[PDB]
Amino acid sequence: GEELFTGVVPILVELDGDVNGHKFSVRGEGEGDATNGKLTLKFICTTGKLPVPWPTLVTTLVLCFARYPDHMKQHDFFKSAMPEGYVQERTISFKDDGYYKTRAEVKFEGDTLVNRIELKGIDFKEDGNILGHKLEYNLNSHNAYITADKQKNGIKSNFKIRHNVEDGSVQLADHYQQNTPIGDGPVLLPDNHYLSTQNALSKDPNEKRDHMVLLEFVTAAGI
């Protein structure tokens, strides 16, 4: 599957969301460059205003674009599943608040790498940090430890995201993640390793819609 990522690849992201009954849609477009681990994307909320903070959706909104160094080539599950793709599911628990459950398919649709997501959020506090929009517009660097999920022929990961709250506190989001191939062909079940991710979030001054401009770098290491 690796050959599909030798150059720059266009990306489409589509998210259908429902958080405490608040329905919303997000569409993202841009490109990814797996040789350097770089993602360049712009996300728009196509239904109006996002009812949750943009940084809480970053992890949900394409790990096949991570830079796997050559000594780790037999450990890149994400590209090995391509072009058929993989399912990515998560439960994301916000400390002292509600939780997200997400199910996505990540696969090639012709020339474009497409991440199509369903998100549900349950048990949030309308005046809490998420539905109350109390999180800074940034996302700090994080490491995610990837382990083989042998029974499912896929991978799993759990990691905590630390969201900066405008009052100086931190809001934890505990991620549990499972990935399963869509195809039947040979995929690469990795040794334990980790992905390192950093993000820059910005705004397009010519964009009057609620939106997020995102730059992301994801690099694999640990073996």
Residue type, 146: I
Q: Report d(CA 78, CA 85) in Å as an integer.
A: 8
Way the structure was solved: X-ray
What are the φ/ψ torsions at residue 73 (nearest 5 degrees)?
A: -65, -35
User: Domain locations in the chain?
Assistant: 2-221
* Resolution in Å, one decimal place: 1.5
Residue 64 near residue 83 (C-beta atoms within 8 A): no
Q: Which two tokens stand for residue 175?
A: 């991620």
Q: Which CATH number applies to 2-221? A: 2.40.155.10
Residue 159 near residue 57 (C-beta atoms within 8 A): no
Q: Report d(CA 116, CA 91) in Å as an integer.
A: 16
How distant, in Å, are the alpha carbons of 8, 144, 196 from that of 219? Answer: 16, 10, 5
Q: Report d(CA 14, CA 113) in Å as an integer.
A: 11
Q: Which residues of 179-194 are buried (b: 16+ CB within 10 A; e: fewer)?
A: bbbeeeeebbbbeebb
Residue 17 has, within 13 A of its CA and on its CB side, a CA count of: 27
Q: Report d(CA 77, CA 148) in Å as an integer.
A: 9
Mapping DSSP onto H, E and C, the string for the chain reads: CHHHHCCEEEEEEEEEEEECCEEEEEEEEEEEECCCCEEEEEEEECCCCCCCCHHHHCCCCCHHHCECCHHHHHHCHHHHCCCCCEEEEEEEEECCCCEEEEEEEEEEECCEEEEEEEEEEECCCCCCCCCCCCECCCCCCEEEEEEEEHHHCEEEEEEEEEEEECCCCEEEEEEEEEEEECCCCCCCCCCCEEEEEEEEEECCCCCCCCEEEEEEEEEEECC
